[PDB]
Each structure stands twice: as structure tokens, then as C-alpha cells.
Amino acid sequence: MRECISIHVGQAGVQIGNACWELYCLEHGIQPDGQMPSDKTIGGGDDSFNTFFSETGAGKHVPRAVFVDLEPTVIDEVRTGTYRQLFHPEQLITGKEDAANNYARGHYTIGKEIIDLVLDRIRKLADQCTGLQGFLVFHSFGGGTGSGFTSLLMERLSVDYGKKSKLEFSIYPAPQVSTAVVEPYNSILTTHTTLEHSDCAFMVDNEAIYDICRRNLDIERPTYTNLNRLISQIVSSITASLRFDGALNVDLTEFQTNLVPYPRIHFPLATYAPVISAEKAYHEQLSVAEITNACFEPANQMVKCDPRHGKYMACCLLYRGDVVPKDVNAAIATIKTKRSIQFVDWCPTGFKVGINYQPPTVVPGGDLAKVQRAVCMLSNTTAIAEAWARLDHKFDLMYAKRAFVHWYVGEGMEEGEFSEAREDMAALEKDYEEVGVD
Amino acid sequence: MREIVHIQAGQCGNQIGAKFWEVISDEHGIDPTGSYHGDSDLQLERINVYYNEATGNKYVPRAILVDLEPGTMDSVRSGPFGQIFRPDNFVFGQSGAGNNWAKGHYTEGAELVDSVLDVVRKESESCDCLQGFQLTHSLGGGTGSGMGTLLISKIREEYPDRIMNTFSVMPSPKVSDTVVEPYNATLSVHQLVENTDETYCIDNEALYDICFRTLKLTTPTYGDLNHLVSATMSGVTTCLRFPGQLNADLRKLAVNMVPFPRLHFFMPGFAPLTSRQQYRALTVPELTQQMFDSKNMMAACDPRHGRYLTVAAIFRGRMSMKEVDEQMLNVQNKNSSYFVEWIPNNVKTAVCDIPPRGLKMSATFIGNSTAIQELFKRISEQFTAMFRRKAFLHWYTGEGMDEMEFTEAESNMNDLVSEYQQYQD
Amino acid sequence: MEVIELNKCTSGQSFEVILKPPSDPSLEEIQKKLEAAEERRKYQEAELLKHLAE
Amino acid sequence: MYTFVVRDENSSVYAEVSRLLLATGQWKRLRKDNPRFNLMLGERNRLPFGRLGHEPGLVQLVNYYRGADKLCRKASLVKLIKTSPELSESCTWFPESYVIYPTNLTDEREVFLAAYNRRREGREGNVWIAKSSAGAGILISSEASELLDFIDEQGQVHVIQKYLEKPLLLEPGHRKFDIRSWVLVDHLYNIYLYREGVLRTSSEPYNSANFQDKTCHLTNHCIQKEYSKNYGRYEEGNEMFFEEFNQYLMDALNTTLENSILLQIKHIIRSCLMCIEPAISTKHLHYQSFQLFGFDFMVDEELKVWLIEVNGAPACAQKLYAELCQGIVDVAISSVFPLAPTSIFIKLHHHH
Ligand SMILES: Nc1nc2c(ncn2[C@@H]2O[C@H](COP(=O)(O)OP(=O)(O)OP(=O)(O)O)[C@@H](O)[C@H]2O)c(=O)[nH]1
Ligand SMILES: Nc1ncnc2c1ncn2[C@@H]1O[C@H](COP(=O)(O)OP(=O)(O)CP(=O)(O)O)[C@@H](O)[C@H]1O
Ligand SMILES: Nc1nc2c(ncn2[C@@H]2O[C@H](COP(=O)(O)OP(=O)(O)O)[C@@H](O)[C@H]2O)c(=O)[nH]1
Ligand SMILES: CCc1noc(C)c1C(=O)Nc1cc(C)on1
Ligand SMILES: CCc1noc(C)c1C(=O)Nc1cc(C)on1
Ligand SMILES: CCc1noc(C)c1C(=O)Nc1cc(C)on1
Ligand SMILES: [Ca+2]
Ligand SMILES: [Ca+2]
Ligand SMILES: [Ca+2]
Ligand SMILES: [Mg+2]
Numbered sequence A: 001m002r003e004c005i006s007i008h009v010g011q012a013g014v015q016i017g018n019a020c021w022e023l024y025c026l027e028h029g030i031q032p033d034g035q036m037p038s039d040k041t042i043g044g045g046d047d048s049f050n051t052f053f054s055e056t057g058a059g060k061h062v063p064r065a066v067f068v069d070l071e072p073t074v075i076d077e078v079r080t081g082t083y084r085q086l087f088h089p090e091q092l093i094t095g096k097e098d099a100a101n102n103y104a105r106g107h108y109t110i111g112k113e114i115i116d117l118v119l120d121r122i123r124k125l126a127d128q129c130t131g132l133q134g135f136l137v138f139h140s141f142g143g144g145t146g147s148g149f150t151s152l153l154m155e156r157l158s159v160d161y162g163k164k165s166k167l168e169f170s171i172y173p174a175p176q177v178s179t180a181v182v183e184p185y186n187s188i189l190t191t192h193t194t195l196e197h198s199d200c201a202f203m204v205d206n207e208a209i210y211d212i213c214r215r216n217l218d219i220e221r222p223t224y225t226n227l228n229r230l231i232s233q234i235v236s237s238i239t240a241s242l243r244f245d246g247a248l249n250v251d252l253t254e255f256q257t258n259l260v261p262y263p264r265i266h267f268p269l270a271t272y273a274p275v276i277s278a279e280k281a282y283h284e285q286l287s288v289a290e291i292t293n294a295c296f297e298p299a300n301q302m303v304k305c306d307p308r309h310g311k312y313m314a315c316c317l318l319y320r321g322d323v324v325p326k327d328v329n330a331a332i333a334t335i336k337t338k339r340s341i342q343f344v345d346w347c348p349t350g351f352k353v354g355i356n357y358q359p360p361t362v363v364p365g366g367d368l369a370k371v372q373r374a375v376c377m378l379s380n381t382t383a384i385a386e387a388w389a390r391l392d393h394k395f396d397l398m399y400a401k402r403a404f405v406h407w408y409v410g411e412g413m414e415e416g417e418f419s420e421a422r423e424d425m426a427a428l429e430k431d432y433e434e435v436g437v438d
Numbered sequence B: 001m002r003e004i005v006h007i008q009a010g011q012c013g014n015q016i017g018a019k020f021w022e023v024i025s026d027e028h029g030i031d032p033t034g035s036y037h038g039d040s041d042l043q044l045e046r047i048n049v050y051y052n053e054a055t056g057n058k059y060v061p062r063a064i065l066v067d068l069e070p071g072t073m074d075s076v077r078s079g080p081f082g083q084i085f086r087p088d089n090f091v092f093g094q095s096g097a098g099n100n101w102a103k104g105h106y107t108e109g110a111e112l113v114d115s116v117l118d119v120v121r122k123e124s125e126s127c128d129c130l131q132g133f134q135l136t137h138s139l140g141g142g143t144g145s146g147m148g149t150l151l152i153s154k155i156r157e158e159y160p161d162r163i164m165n166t167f168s169v170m171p172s173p174k175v176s177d178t179v180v181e182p183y184n185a186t187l188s189v190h191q192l193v194e195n196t197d198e199t200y201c202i203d204n205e206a207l208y209d210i211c212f213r214t215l216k217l218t219t220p221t222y223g224d225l226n227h228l229v230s231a232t233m234s235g236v237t238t239c240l241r242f243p244g245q246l247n248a249d250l251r252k253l254a255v256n257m258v259p260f261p262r263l264h265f266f267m268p269g270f271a272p273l274t275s276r277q278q279y280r281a282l283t284v285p286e287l288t289q290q291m292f293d294s295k296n297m298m299a300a301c302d303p304r305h306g307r308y309l310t311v312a313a314i315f316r317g318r319m320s321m322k323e324v325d326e327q328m329l330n331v332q333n334k335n336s337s338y339f340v341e342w343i344p345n346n347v348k349t350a351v352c353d354i355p356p357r358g359l360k361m362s363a364t365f366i367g368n369s370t371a372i373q374e375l376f377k378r379i380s381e382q383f384t385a386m387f388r389r390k391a392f393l394h395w396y397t398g399e400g401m402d403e404m405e406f407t408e409a410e411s412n413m414n415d416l417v418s419e420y421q422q423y424q425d
Numbered sequence C: 001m002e003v004i005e006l007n008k009c010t011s012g013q014s015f016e017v018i019l020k021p022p023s024d025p026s027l028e029e030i031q032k033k034l035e036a037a038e039e040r041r042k043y044q045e046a047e048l049l050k051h052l053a054e
Numbered sequence D: 001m002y003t004f005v006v007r008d009e010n011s012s013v014y015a016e017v018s019r020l021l022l023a024t025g026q027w028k029r030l031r032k033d034n035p036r037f038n039l040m041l042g043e044r045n046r047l048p049f050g051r052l053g054h055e056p057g058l059v060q061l062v063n064y065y066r067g068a069d070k071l072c073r074k075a076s077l078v079k080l081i082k083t084s085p086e087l088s089e090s091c092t093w094f095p096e097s098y099v100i101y102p103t104n105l106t107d108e109r110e111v112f113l114a115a116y117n118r119r120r121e122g123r124e125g126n127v128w129i130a131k132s133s134a135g136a137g138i139l140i141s142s143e144a145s146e147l148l149d150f151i152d153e154q155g156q157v158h159v160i161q162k163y164l165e166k167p168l169l170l171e172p173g174h175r176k177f178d179i180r181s182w183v184l185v186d187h188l189y190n191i192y193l194y195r196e197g198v199l200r201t202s203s204e205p206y207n208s209a210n211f212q213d214k215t216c217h218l219t220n221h222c223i224q225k226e227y228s229k230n231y232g233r234y235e236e237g238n239e240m241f242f243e244e245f246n247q248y249l250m251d252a253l254n255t256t257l258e259n260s261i262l263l264q265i266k267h268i269i270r271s272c273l274m275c276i277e278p279a280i281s282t283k284h285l286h287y288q289s290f291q292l293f294g295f296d297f298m299v300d301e302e303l304k305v306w307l308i309e310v311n312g313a314p315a316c317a318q319k320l321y322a323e324l325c326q327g328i329v330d331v332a333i334s335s336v337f338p339l340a341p342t343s344i345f346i347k348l349h350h351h352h
């Protein structure tokens, strides 16, 4: 057994982190006080769920998590929330004033003064690991902390944990649920400095999660609670292999191996199905083929884009529930003769499949209805580059006038770092086009 | 605990400031004695933003009252909520400022500024984490304009990285006390361009026309004009005083509304505005239609004459947040020619469940529009009409000022107009 | 349409289906960046105080 | 109040649509770089589909199908036909074609020479035509040596297909011609065939013993009006519409345009568009697409119809701009943005 340390930075990461650890507990039968009756090895053991939970002599299962925010309002909810007993105070780190949606502020002005403390708290959790694999880092692109502080933390983690893997769960900025116009700056600044430090990043576009909540859950005005309970379902589907018995994606290393043949192109597209409104009278349960086919619909992708006009470098199918290999292969053969699935010539044309028999757990009172089987597809498509294009374009509109740039230079950042980050994105976009277009 | 320190200076500043504390004290359930008597926990959640908590569960506003004569502040202390203010926080002289910027900034004001800062320093030392300062004042007088801007210059020196916001009443010949208001306003505008993060430009002519044309008040008074400023100040600060919409931060709001450091002068708005047909229910479309109509604009500037750099709208009341988005998108997607297209999504909307007193719902408008240059153009043309004959200068040269200082104020604001012009094309 | 590497356990199974064959900065360098930005803040604030002293 | 942008100043078609929309008083045009638009009349090359459908509260519609170039490219169309089981390689309505890359750059050089050597031995007609999408540059020759040597001198991909040695000729004149059919596909993938077509006729007598003079062999409007000396003799601008052409087929051949030619045309249009529907459909997409297509057909003396190419940015006949452009507003634009007949189109029903 090898441990994984989760790190939640900023409001987005903390709130999402809260929704995921709630789900992890309900999936592993861990109660709010940390007790786990099913665990027969008291105060120890090297089980699959121990990759995310340590154990105390008192039988408490403590997440291997750290929460970091430059302002205490969001982390304060965790300290007094339903699962306040899972964590101890050392795990929840809060400042007094935030980065004000300013990358430079979270990276330089305030980041420089708190980085050495965060690292010390992470070291404490690492000291409890007999074979640490790496880190899962949750954060937003738009926040000054989610973007500015994360990139600094990622730089230092590479310095203090050279051979460890680092995966991201990054929230792509969507204006519909955003009250800040400078988020395109922060996103491109943080993607520039984080790129060489992240082995695999899962981008979730709030726009996609928003319309899935309106379309499938009939939520007219989705809240962050709605969005985060949905995101944590997808996150749970991606990390299940690390927490349960199995042979696919058993360690963080296997993610880059199976999803990222080229290092810079480490942004797999995620697609999840089915998402059924729990308020529905009672839905007809979908088959293996119906949910598998749904993985090639744009309406359930975490990032809206057209995979038909890209090229695949890898494709993973992660099933949960009543699923046998025979039905998977039957649906795949049917999707090939119907769908547009163009792989890159230097990659094989295949699918790695993982099946966990336990169907998705639903949060009591949540929005999602219980289903007999679900699937999450992880596919590395060049079509996800569309999202970079949209984002790079907004950056160019503002930066051409240097709008809001003074707020960044005022925190010690040099203006040139803007263009230095933008040029990097221009290279990232060119890399996708060389891989997907003819 | 993100505290704000409030300062009100001069006649206009203290009368408008007083009404502000009168309006929000009623929203947070604070009586004229400082005791709370509301019925909702939301009234106390963000209460420490503008109020210090004293013994006995008393809430004393975090405000400092400044003036160079006693008259006005004597009224506040005798006014409705006069007893609510901290006694030590009344700082005043006896000489007055004679509607003279130089007296407020260099002579009379300078004699009194140090003691005013001792109170500001005292209020900040108790803040768990000081967010920033807000000042209410007029630019046409002598104390609020001359000494007000002196206070800002010294506050920035001592707190260089805290946010400095002002609500500034701009003079107008139609609602004028003396002919030198253009002089005092032009000298203050330069101080504001340098040393404030946000300035809410309030034009007394716009306030007058609203009282006359819209509210149908035959003979408006300063008190009538101050009712509007009251409601507007409560609107723009609603997101700071009540929970729900995070990112409610002074610097965060400045970061998103000010794309360029010197262009930080906002046009405020408010809806509804009804004369006494006052009980009619107001729909969301009507709210949005009015909130964007120029007649509800308080800067006496036609937005259709320029372009919006950034817009922030705060809706108050129990309403369909879904229908809000629909109507806001309708205003933009039906007039996108008045928003600069090089700032994507430069219109943001926030909702608030608690409505103001006596209103089922309301909307407050906060616009960073390049049409605000029309306001500085008015003041500049009035300045030049007198300065070209050196009329009334002796009131200032007698306090130690030179003509050169006027010429540079002139050039500084004409430059400010040039900056707004290049971003309009 | 070949199935390979079939692994089965109590909590599920996993396999691979092949349809078609194919055809950093040191700790010192980081501190310098963090200290350079702080030096540009100090220089900008000094000029702001120098301006206020005039 | 609907809003649209214009990003193709060279489109004679959507220049009229933009004119008609403004006339409705319910559509307002914006600068070409304004994202808050309902309708984009986009550029030809490198249309940024990836930025569409991401503006909150705006249903956005564009006048091009992403991925339709597969059908509107000389080389792409040949590859689409030979590889799509829907069309198969034995497709009976598409001339035997081969994709040939110049030797300075898969490629079907030998496969073409095998079929060529077979014809040259079987005493059959062995006349081919080489062409490419980078032309105003066409060559018609009966010797395979000339066809290959011609492409190698260029630097872009070319396509060699069998030249119809027995094309149907109009009388009087004894002249070649092609038929242009405009087809519109709305956001629902309804295939509409504009009732009005045009025959681009040659004003020069067809001569099968001289492919060197390409004035009587190529029916392009720009060729006849520049290198042909009989331009506009028989019909105005070398453009005969269906009324006259139908009347001719009845007087000479004792048949109608509907039965002898229009059935084959409508069948070809369905097979092509239905073939790529799963690849270009925008039914479940965050934005919506529609596109006007200009098909080109050939007719032989047996009254069999062959497909020449498909144009993704076609122009219309001068006389039919009003009727057609208006039709686009009705079925393609107003269908998504309604305004506060006897359809001019022929819906070709099909299975989605
Ligand atoms: N999905 C999701 N997105 C969130 C959540 N909270 C904030 N966001 C997104 O994050 C972006 C803003 O960044 P934040 O994470 O809130 O800011 P921050 O990281 O705390 O940094 P500061 O600027 O210092 O507050 C916006 O685009 C929001 O839509 C959340 O709980 N769930
Ligand atoms: N295989 C073939 N057999 C007979 N004629 C052919 C032919 N290929 C092309 N042509 C002749 O060439 C003309 C069409 O040329 P083509 O369409 O390939 O060039 P082009 O695309 O530049 C003209 P447009 O796109 O405007 O229709 C027709 O008029 C036809 O007479
Ligand atoms: N809106 C409003 N404006 C005022 C009020 N009192 C004065 N003014 C304006 O303020 C300017 C005079 O400044 P004043 O405050 O009286 O001078 P000060 O006391 O020395 O600061 C003139 O332009 C007046 O129109 C008031 O109560 N309300
Ligand atoms: C809407 C109320 C609000 N609450 O927190 C913030 C931050 C805002 C705000 O106005 N954000 C803006 C405005 C523009 C333009 O870009 N971002
Ligand atoms: C607002 C009342 C007031 N208070 O002090 C002054 C000076 C005024 C004033 O200008 N009154 C006006 C304006 C017009 C027109 O007629 N009367
Ligand atoms: C940026 C416009 C805005 N939009 O929502 C809020 C809240 C504001 C705002 O800045 N309010 C205040 C309060 C004080 C003092 O100064 N500004
Ligand atoms: Ca155990
Ligand atoms: Ca590394
Ligand atoms: Ca004195
Ligand atoms: Mg935050």
C-alpha cells in the first residue's frame, strides 16, 4: 500500500475537497466521527482505503488531506461542518486576507510568506507515509489563491518531492458563475508556471457542470453545492482505483502511463453518465451500451468541445456497478461502427477498461438518483485544446490594452511574465494542432 | 473580520454621512442608542464591518466626524442617531474653511489634521484586519474638499496598502453655494486621481433633477438630495454588509472594476425612484430598465455618450435570481455597442435577500463609464472661465497658494479627460 | 477486437481491448524570484513615500 | 432584437442575407469581433468553431458545418467515397477517381496505372482529367504519361478521374454543359433542394478529337466568358434554367427533367449528406450549424448523372439571388430566431 496526499487550495479546492471527502466516507463506510466498523485492523493496516485514510489507535480514520486558503471563511465551514471530526487543526490552514482574485498576490506578496508553513504541514502528513506516491491538488483557475498560490506550491513540491507524482483537479473559469473579469489572466499565469510541474490535470469547466445540472437535474439556478456534489462524483470515479482493490490505475504513476504519451498534453477529457435527477418519478435504468454510448455525447463532457474533430491519444473506461466485460466489448464494437473515433497513428487504437462492482454512492439529500451502473471515460483528445483557445482569446482582448495589468505589477510581478506565459500557451496550442490536425 | 473605517468631513460630508448611518443602522437593527433589536441573524453576521462591539452588546459605528466649524456636527450630535456616535470621534475646529480649498488643505485644515489621524489610528489599531477606508465629502466646499483630500494623502502615507474609497459630491452651478466651487473641485479631483482606489461621483445637479423631474418634488432641499445619496450608499455597500455572495471584498471589487489606475471614478445608480402610485409592485424587467436608464444615473452624465469599462449591479430582495440573469443579459445583448469589447464579461450581477426598508426590492448600479469625462469637462470649463481672468484667486493666494498650482490642477484634469477619451474609441 | 490483461478480484475486474495496432528550478532559484518581486514592491513603495514627502 | 456578425466580405450570397436581415428591422449587425451575437456569417478558411456556444444566454448559429470540407474538397471527396461503406468503392454515380500526390511529397499512383493499363488494352475509352482544389489548372489527356508529369510539376495534391467521353450535348450547338444544384441544410439536418437550378453551358461545339483546347470541354462560367468566342449566343450568359431545359428534354428526347435527371440528382445529394451526418451533425452540440452547398453534376448521352464536386462556399445565379437568399432567411435563420409558400425548396426526407 502506498499513500496519496490530497491538497485543496482556495475556495474552489476547499469546497470541492469537502464534497469529495464526504463521498469517500460514504463509499468506505466511514462515519463523521472517523470510526469505520468494517475495518477489522484497529489503528493500522495497509488496505486500499488506507491510501487516503490514516488510522489512530482510537480507531479513527483521518483523511490524508491539507486545506489552504488565504482567508478563513471557507475553511471555517469545515471546522464546524458535519465532518469537522475527521480532521485535526493542523490540516486546516487559513490566512486573514485573500489574494483579491490577483495571481501575483497569491503567488508573490502573500504566497511567499505562507509557503514554508504549508510545506511544514504537508511534511507532517508525509512523515506518516511508508511509501508516498504523490499528491492530488484541487484548485481553481480564476481565484488569486487557487491560481497564484497553487503554482508556487507546485514548484516547491517538485523541489521537496522530486520523484513523486502530482495530479490536478482544476476548475476552468465560466463567466456564468463568476464575479471577476481577470480570471483569464490568472488561468494563463497559473497554467504557465504549473505546466512543467503537473503530471496529469483534469480540467472541469464550470460551464459544463452548470448546464448538466440544469439539463439533467432540472436545477434552474445551480449552487456551488449542486456543482460540487456532481464534481465529487466524477472525482470519486477517477480516484476509485487508488482506493479499492483492482489492477488498473493502481498508483498515480499509471495515470501518466495510460493517459499521457506526451508530457505537455496532460489534460484528459472526462465524460460521465448517467446523471439522473433524484426528484424524477423513477427513471428507466440504462444498459452498458446506452451509458457507454453516452460517453461520446458532448452534453456530458466536463469540458464542452467536439471530440469528433480531434484525435485520441488514450481512452479509459471506468465502470461502477453491475457491469461485466462481455457487455462492455459489445457496446464498444457498436460505437466504433457508428462514432467518429480517430486515434493518432503513433498510438494504439484501444480502450483500457476498469470495472468496480460497487455502484456509485449517492449523498443523502443530494440531487443525484441511485443508478445500477455508471461510467466515467477519460480520453486524451486534442479537442480539449478548444478550451485553451477560448481562454487564450480572452487573455489577448484584455492584455492588448494592458487592462488590469497594473494590479499585477503592483504586487511585484514583472509585466513580461504576462507575455512569457502567453507565449507558452501559444506553444501548447501549436502542440495540440501538430498532434490532431493533418 | 474585515473592518472598514468611515470618515465624514465638512458640512455636506457629515450630513450625508449621518443619513448613511441612519439608513444602515435601521437595516442591521441598531437603534439610536446602539442596541440591537432586529429579528434575523443576517443583521449581525457582517455587523462588525461598520460597527465596533462595546460592552453590553452595544454597537458603536466605526466612524470619525471631522469639520472645521462646530455648527454641522452640533446638529448630528442633536440629530436622530447623534447619540450613537463615539464622543471621542468628533474632531472639529472653530475657525471654519470659508469654502476655501487652501484653508482646508494648507492652513486651517493642517492645524487640525494630526489630531484627526490620532483617531483614525486608534480605530484601525482595534481592527482584526482593516479592509480599507471610506470618506464622504463634497468637492465644492473647503473642509470636505481641501481637508478631506489632505486626510486621504496622509492616510495613504500611513496605510499605503489599504483601500481608499470616497463618495464625492461634485458641485454644480444649478445647486451652488459659492462661485468658487469649480476651483475647489478641480484641486480635489487631482488628489483623488492619485490617492483613491474608488470614487463614487455624485453630481448635485443629477440629484436635483431626480428630485424635481422624477420624484416630483417642487422645491428640493439638501435633505431631499441626501435621501438619494443615503439609499445609494446603502445599495453599493449591501454586498459588504450582508452574507451570501463571497468575493465581497474592497480590494477584490477594485481589482475587477478598475482596469487602469487613474480611471476609478464610478457613476452610481438606483432603482426604483417613485413619487407619491408608490405601492405598485416593481417587476424585474422594470428594475433593470430603470437601473440602466440615465435618469436614474447620479453623475449627470449620459452613458450613451461613452462606453462602459465595467459594470456591477446589486439586486436586493426576494426575487427570481433566474429572471435576473435573463434581464441583465437582455440589457447587454440589446445594447452591446455601449460596452467595450476588450473586457469579456464586464457586467456582473449580485443578488441579496434582504431588501431596503420600505421596498419589496431594489437595484443599485455601479458603472465605470468613459462618459464620466463629461463631468470633468463641465468642471474644467467652469474653472477656466474664471481662472482666465484670475477671478476670486485672492481668497487662495492669501492662504499661501500660487497661480502655478492652479495651472497644474487645470492640466492634470484635462489630461484626465484625454485618458477617458482614448479608451472611448 | 482482442481482450488482454484480464484481472479479476472480489471488487471488480479490468482488462484492455485493442481494436487496431498503431502505425526544474532549484530552491535557490525560486527564492530569487520571490525576493526579486518583493524588491520591486519595496522600490515602488519607496517612490510613493518619496512622492508624499515632496 | 437579434444580432449577427459578418466575417466574409467576399460572399455574394450572405451579403444579400445580411441585406435582407437588416431590412426586417429585427436584426442588428455588430462588429466582426463582437462575441455577443446570435448569428455568425463566418469566414471561409479557419473559422473558429471552438469559440461558439460559450456566451451565457445566447443561442448562436453559424453558416458552416464543421467537418463538411471532407465533402467539398477534390481529394477529400474521393477518399470519403472509397472509404465510406455507405458509398462504397463501386459507387455507380461517381466517376472512377484516384488520389495522386506529386513526387516531391495514401497515394494511388500504381492503382491508377493498373486500371489505366487495363483500359488501354481493352480498346476502351482511356481519356482522363487531372485537377485540384488549388486551381483557378486542369489537364485533359488520353496518355497517362502526360497526366502524371503534369501533377509532378505542381506542389499540391491532385485527383485523376475518368473523363466522360460521351457527355450529353445540347442542340443546336453540339455543346457540353454541367448542372448546378444548390442545397441547404438547416440546424435540424433537413436537406432542402432549391427548386431552381442552372446549366452552365459551353458556347463551343464539343470536340472529342482535341482536348488541348479546353474551351468546349470545361463549362466554367469564367472560362466561357474569357476564352470562348460564342459566349451568350444561345442563352444569356451561358445559363439555361430548368424551364427551358425541361422544355428541351421534352421536345427532343420526349422526357422530363424530373424523371431523367432530377431523380438521380436528389438521390446523390441524399447519399452524400446522409453519409457524413454523424460526423458533422450539431443536434446535441452547444452551438448550431447550417450551410449552403453547390453540387455540380454531369450528364451523359445515356441520361446518367455523375457527380463532379461539391462547393462549400458556392455563388448563386444572378437571377436567383433574391428568391434563394430569402429562402435561407426563412428556413435556416428564422427557424431558430423567429420574427415577430409554396416552399421554394424540395425537402428530401431521410432517416437520421
Ligand atoms: N465548481 C466550483 N467552482 C468554484 C467554487 N468556488 C469558487 N469557484 C470558482 O472559482 C473561481 C474563483 O476563484 P476562487 O476559488 O473562488 O478564489 P480563491 O482560490 O479562493 O482565491 P482568492 O481570490 O484569494 O479568493 C470562479 O470561477 C468560481 O466559479 C466551488 O465551490 N465549486
Ligand atoms: N471527370 C470529368 N468528366 C467530364 N468533364 C469534367 C470532369 N471533371 C471536370 N469536368 C469539367 O470541368 C468542369 C468542372 O470543373 P471543376 O468543378 O472540377 O473545377 P472548379 O471547381 O474550379 C469549377 P466550380 O467549383 O466552380 O464548379 C465541368 O464543367 C466539367 O465539364
Ligand atoms: N448633496 C448635498 N450637497 C451639499 C450639502 N451641503 C452642501 N452641499 C454641496 O457641497 C458644496 C459646499 O461644500 P460644503 O460641504 O458646504 O463645504 P465644507 O463644509 O467646507 O466642506 C456645494 O457644492 C453644495 O452644493 C448636502 O447636505 N447635500
Ligand atoms: C457583483 C458583485 C460582486 N461581488 O464580488 C465581486 C468581486 C463583485 C463584482 O462586482 N465583480 C465584478 C465586476 C466586474 C466588471 O468584474 N467583476
Ligand atoms: C437644493 C436646495 C438648495 N439648498 O441650497 C441651495 C444653494 C439650493 C439650491 O440650489 N436650490 C435651487 C436650485 C434651483 C434650480 O432652484 N433652487
Ligand atoms: C465595485 C462596485 C461594487 N459592487 O458591489 C460592491 C459591494 C461594490 C463596492 O465597491 N462597494 C463599496 C463600499 C465602499 C465603502 O466602497 N465601495
Ligand atoms: Ca485498518
Ligand atoms: Ca517534476
Ligand atoms: Ca489658527
Ligand atoms: Mg477565496
Ligand SMILES: [Mg+2]
Residues within 6 Å of the ligand: B011, B012, B141, B177
Ligand atoms: Mg456649507
Ligand SMILES: [Mg+2]
Residues within 6 Å of the ligand: D309, D311
Ligand atoms: Mg471548386
